[PDB]
Design a protein around this ligand. Structure first.
Ligand SMILES: NC[C@H]1CC[C@H](C(=O)N[C@@H](Cc2ccccc2)c2nc(-c3ccc4c(N)[nH]nc4c3)c(Cl)[nH]2)CC1
Length: 238
């Protein structure tokens, strides 16, 4: 996250750090708890990931330094990538991780509500992007979870900022015209959380962008409301 500040412990309790174990253990992507055995994240995180056996999900983490060999984590039973996904820039950048065990909810780890179908018309004015990503273009994964408040931008405005790309209605953008605050390398897969009627909703999944916090280059996110039927299809299968 560029231009953000340290989060307080328990502030974003749906935020997870997805680590890979191959070749060495390190943070790979962000993710969000949406159900007791379900993590919602970005499909692009799995490029070259041949098996869910190399993945570890850590919930209730503020600092990456809390993670050692003796730290509990959730194993991944299954990786579910949207079947229309080709690349982040073309959309369908959404995946579900089915966990091997059940997340016990509490003040450190709990789910974020998915947006409502009726709420596709609501105007979100209180949106935050979080993650352990870079604070500048050439950096390293941050120890402390960062946060930044970012305004949502219309599809029309985002399309003007991305000449040569196709910004679909299954994408949602957020950024300041002058830049300064944005998601950056390592934040992908994490949430874009918006507060409405005292309830937080998972509005976006950090997906892609041209650089980090550049003027007239907002972050592009998976527009979660457009995938609520797909999420229910996969999580509520009979
Ligand atoms: N302004 C809008 C934002 C939107 C999100 C975007 C992003 O985050 N894209 C992803 C894509 C990706 C690429 C490779 C694996 C998973 C996902 C990324 N993640 C790392 C990354 C990850 C872990 C790292 C680590 N352990 N050390 N360094 C690390 C850097 C790199 Cl590089 N690019 C950056 C621009």
């Amino acid at each position: 996250i560029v231009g953000g500040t340290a989060s307080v412990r328990g502030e974003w309790p749906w935020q997870v750090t997805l680590h890979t174990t191959s070749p060495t253990q390190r943070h790979l992507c962000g993710g969000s708890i949406i159900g007791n055995q379900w993590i919602l994240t970005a499909a692009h995180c799995f490029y070259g990931v041949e098996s869910p056996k190399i993945l570890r999900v850590y919930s209730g983490i503020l600092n990456q330094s809390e993670i050692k060999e003796d730290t509990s984590f959730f194993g991944v039973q299954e990786i579910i990538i949207h079947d229309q996904y080709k690349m982040a820039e073309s959309g369908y950048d959404i995946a579900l991780l089915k966990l091997e065990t059940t997340v016990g909810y509490g003040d450190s780890q709990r789910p974020i509500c998915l947006p409502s179908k009726g709420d596709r018309n609501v105007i979100y004015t209180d949106c935050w992007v979080t993650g352990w990503g870079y604070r500048k273009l050439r950096d390293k994964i941050q120890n402390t979870l960062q946060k930044a408040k970012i305004p949502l931008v219309t599809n029309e405005e985002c399309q003007k900022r991305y000449r040569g790309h196709k910004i679909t209605h299954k994408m949602i953008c957020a950024g300041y015209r002058e830049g300064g605050k944005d998601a950056c390398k390592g934040d992908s897969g994490g949430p874009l959380s918006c507060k409405h009627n005292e309830v937080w909703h998972l509005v976006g999944i950090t997906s892609w962008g041209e650089g980090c916090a550049q003027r007239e280059r907002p972050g592009v996110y998976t527009n979660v409301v457009e995938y609520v039927d797909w999420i229910l299809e996969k999580t509520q299968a009979v």
